[PDB]
Symmetry: D2
Subunit: 372 residues, 4 copies
């Protein structure tokens, strides 16, 4: 089963998605379906054609509407900035195409809602690309939790710390522009952590939060106001009684892609650091008193997704393997006419949480999360 993909957007993500479509069958064999890089769309025809040569798409187009309207495209992948996710995804749904959309699902909850509405009664597979939950080490922690190996979860600390724009001479790209992005650190990076909280712990009841802009204007390369958050911190109460906290910032010198978490359970703990993604740290309370401690577990054949990755632990998981796994699960769901997680349902829930964080920060009070 060969599926033609139409990739919309050929920036950093275009390359990550193309990589996965190229590589995924080499990894997961026999593959549930073969990706075909059939057509890539970009802002103008020279870029489109150049992106296609670079990523190995057969065709190219200056209009994505060309892809939605082409009946032999089975999969629309949306790798555009956050302002185009909804319009393209709703056209794709109406055209009955299977859809993977990059995060955040959209700019607001209300806009994420329409995308969900347009998809939820169709007979298509819809996905949002929170690829980090498919880091093997994160699946491994999920396995540990679900098999009861750390007891009931008490507590969750999560972070996403970067510094790529800590320098205020960094320009005012779309990530800093509210009307395109919807939010700053919150939508761009905190959403990956929120998804991990949801996957590993469970649903959010309420949030109580603080948003900070540290660099309120930047040069307009290619002096503009930064009307989004640079940093977010929020306390969380979970439906299942767990408590927790998330912190994300663009302004943490010495932190590059420091997605982490620490889960405290009644019978153990789990710690994850994406800058060292090959590793999961786990402490079992049932260890013998003189050999109790976090053990560092390197992922490989023995761990979730091991079958289709590298032959020994620590041969090296990179960004690209997270996207290969994602694609595997997506195309598997299509091949077997099932659903995948996280879906637009998961996407819309994250957008509601985000809105509840913004709300909470304006009112400076606990705000209950709407549960879809």
């Amino acid at each position: 089963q060969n599926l033609n993909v139409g990739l919309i957007g050929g920036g950093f993500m275009g390359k990550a998605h193309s990589l996965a479509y190229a590589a995924m069958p080499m990894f997961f064999w026999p593959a549930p379906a073969l990706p075909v890089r059939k057509v890539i769309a970009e802002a103008n025809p020279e870029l489109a054609a150049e992106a296609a040569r670079r990523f190995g798409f057969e065709n190219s187009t200056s209009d994505w509407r060309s892809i939605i309207d082409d009946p032999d495209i089975h999969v629309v992948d949306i790798a555009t900035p956050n302002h185009l996710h909804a319009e393209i995804a709703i056209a794709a749904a109406e055209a009955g195409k299977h859809i993977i959309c990059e995060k955040p699902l959209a700019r607001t909850g209300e806009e994420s809602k329409a995308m969900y509405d347009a998809v939820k009664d169709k007979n298509i597979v819809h996905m949002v690309a929170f690829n980090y939950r498919r880091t093997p080490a994160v699946a491994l922690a999920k396995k540990y939790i679900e098999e009861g190996a750390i007891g009931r979860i008490l507590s969750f600390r999560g972070t996403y710390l970067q510094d790529w724009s800590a320098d205020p001479n960094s320009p005012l790209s779309w990530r800093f522009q509210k009307s395109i992005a919807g939010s700053g650190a919150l939508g761009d990076i905190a959403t990956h952590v929120i998804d991990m909280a949801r996957y590993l712990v469970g649903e959010f009841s309420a949030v109580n939060a603080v948003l900070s802009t540290w660099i309120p204007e930047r040069p307009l390369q290619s002096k503009g106001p930064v009307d989004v958050d640079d940093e977010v911190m929020t306390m969380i109460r979970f439906a299942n009684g767990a408590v927790g906290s998330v912190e994300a910032t663009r302004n943490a010198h010495g932190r590059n892609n420091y997605i982490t978490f620490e889960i405290h359970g009644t019978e153990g703990s789990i710690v994850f650091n994406y800058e060292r993604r090959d590793e999961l740290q786990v402490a079992f309370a049932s260890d013998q008193a003189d050999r109790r401690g976090f053990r560092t577990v390197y992922t490989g054949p023995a761990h979730p997704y091991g079958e289709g990755l590298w032959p020994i632990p620590a041969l090296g998981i990179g960004y690209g393997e997270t996207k290969i796994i994602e694609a595997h699960d997506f195309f598997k769901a299509i091949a077997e006419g099932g659903s995948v997680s996280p879906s637009f349902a998961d996407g819309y829930q994250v957008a509601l949480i985000d809105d509840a964080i913004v709300e909470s920060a304006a009112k400076e009070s606990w705000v209950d999360v709407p549960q879809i």
Copy 2:
């Protein structure tokens, strides 16, 4: 000069203090003053004798009033549970004695006030035992900060995570009893973190917190647990910086996990007490291609180095923190100067705690009673 010490209590903080006295001048020489282990109080006379023999005091007693009524006693050291801090220090105050008291200062901010009031206007050195601040790494952090080497502080994340009581069959000690501890994690370990925040970032403007009790009853020596196992709080600092503090007793694999991460405009600092000897600092001024966290091991080139070990990583333990603390306490007495942190700092911490509890109850931002 030979200052005589009246130690009240010889428990888990029995050998800690007594080591400090015994060893301080060995380390920092010439010494400001020689601590003399004069007398130690415990609850019963046999217990006290046992203690004095062990901790190498000259004398002992069962009544702590004895100590405060002796005019030979230059220094009182309070290492009792939290229910007796106040009454002893207020008495010791009147007796004109120098005081060092364990944390938390008292069970509440009302009880802490008294103690503060009782030393305010008296001409005596008063110290509260937030010893972890005097880990060299944390002094080295203070150094970089106030040097301006990491710029203006944006953010503070601090933790004190433990697991000694994570097992529910762990018995109901005083630390789990509200009326004698005052509070749980908040008092017993959060207070260490709060102080480091006050020390490295500055004063608390306001807090918004959650307290949690996971194991609500424990076997007796079963009885209820009417205190804090875990505390989560966000913070507004008086200086614009934001941050958060998190402490627990129910974190499997966390033993003495006092950490912080500070984010400045020009750099970052990371500390982990489970590896005391190290401080992580990351400078923006580094060349693009050799920029990241540098792991500095502490020794002669760092604060308090001159009177610790001759090379970095020969190793800093719990005892050294107490040695450095003693030195600074006695150097203050010797100079008729003063010391940080004092009962003013302890009182402040007790207000932050009260505001935290008040916050958790109201599920609201509370302004810290400055």
Copy 3:
């Protein structure tokens, strides 16, 4: 622009490079074509072709040399067949990459060197790990004198995948086919790192070992499980290297620790995104190993991920290979870890074998 490839054969790793090389490094030196692939029979070879996405397949590997429309040959066979395929491919004027170790022995390897040394072809051995961005950064550091002149060296490669005696007796455990054990399999990658970072070897003295005598199919192992050699370098530096298969808790632990006159470097491939660099010129109160995450600012970083610690995996390593290999071809220059390097290493292996025989130091036929 379009070089046709003929892979013959962990053949996914190579196929990923060819698929993915132009996505990363763009403009591409030359667009690779997965044209043909050979395996031990035509069904497996047709399986391989569907999985790894080659246009065409064969069970007879001579076919691919015999084809003139090929350009590149990629030898991912076990260790007994490198030279046969290498020599044959050389005579056909074929651009070549071959896996490590170059062959079972130095002599076997000598052939391969001569076959190519004369010809008009880019030739390469598959020391991919040296193209880990962190290791390439550690070069940038050493070559600008930033660590001064190199004194000492401690490379390792500790694995544990056959530390169970019940792990079966595959080909990597037969001198017949593997040549050596840990020495040729993995120690070979560290020896190349030594050469690329400090310099040429001068003499070595070694204790080969075997902890697993028999493994199931129950037959004998007739190769080294573990090797430590001591080293004197041409430049005057000192060093030691220790590669094993029997270190429980070690998976793909490729360590090095260089000591220079103005600094140090440590590397751990298990955390390959990091290099640790300690500079003596650091203010004395803020001096120590600093942890550098590789990214755009560092070597090969312009055509990898847009931010550090987004993650480098085994694959990007091989991607950078395919980039430099094809870069050599499309220009006409030459790629470093060549058969020369393969041959030199094979000799170091021979020396090391000798050393553990003669319980003494053994100079190294520098070439």
Copy 4:
């Protein structure tokens, strides 16, 4: 009872005596800082008040000749190691003795001979091997928990003498010290190997020196860095390496031990941690466990009530002391004994020769 000590780096030992009973209690024997010696009567008096001795002296002889004292403790450079040890032994004095035991094994012989026939409680200060983490390794091993030992790596990397303008102290002078790194530091690793595996049967090494002249500028005549391989008497193979010219390493005493059914790793820059990987872990959760030392672990009965409250150099020597004073008050032996001390010295000479010619060299195994 009160075992009066005579203390001929000096603040570490004094700390031990002062502190050791409040740690381990009921204590085995309450030490007395009774006499301290040193270069001259000024330094001695100064040192005596600092480290809280009852008396001082400028002649070490006087301490031997004083039959009120119970214990000698040598803390001088290597040149003065021998002529004190014998005298103290003849005098029938209990002994501790800063490593290395002597500038040469030649000399060390006498020191063992002098002791062993009389039933002295006698020791050499290999303090690191009583870091609780290393004790926990011994316990793991002894228990079989990592099965049989196969291989061994050990290190001592330092950088204090890594700037050439660093002064020509007594550790770069052959006649005084005897060995540089080999005997100043590499000796500690040797002791660990000997303790966690077994005896050395043969050795090969390379000595190296990177800074020949220093300010005092005189000439440096000793080994800056030493690299050696090992064959253990039980089959195991090994490596030992130490240097003074390793920028970024401060006090980096380390080992990695591969067992049949596990591995153990130690980094003294983080003494509180032992890293153990048990092969018997389930396959989806297998790897190095970082264990923080506390009550559950060895020596934990008399240290801090919580793991990671923190172990420093001092605690190391408080254990060294309580073992010794435990060995006097019950009368048995103590490892590492002068025996252990001499073996190390022999091992050290083998290494000297090993490097000398460039071939392997058996270890005269006592």
